[PDB]
Amino acid sequence: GKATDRMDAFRKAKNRAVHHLHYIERYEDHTIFHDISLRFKRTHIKMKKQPKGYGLRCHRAIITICRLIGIKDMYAKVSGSINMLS
């Protein structure tokens, strides 16, 4: 969201994000199905499937996104550029 005022920016991003919803497949509704290794531009994300009780041991932003998705147990290492958008 972009705006001169911070409130307008918050509103635009919040309302527009709801129209661009992914659906994430959760294994047993707590973790990912398999280990995912990917490179988006210059950002490397390597996620590993973990058992129950492991917790979220990943980049803080990833922790926040995981709680919104519903993933409880996962490990992830972010390498390369740590651009938040990427």
Binding site: M7, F10, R11, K14
Partner: peptide, 14 residues
């Protein structure tokens, strides 16, 4: 939760 000041009744109110 940080409450964004909610818009009032549209001022323009055509």
């Amino acid at each position: 939760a940080f409450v964004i000041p909610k818009k009032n009744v549209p001022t323009s109110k055509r």
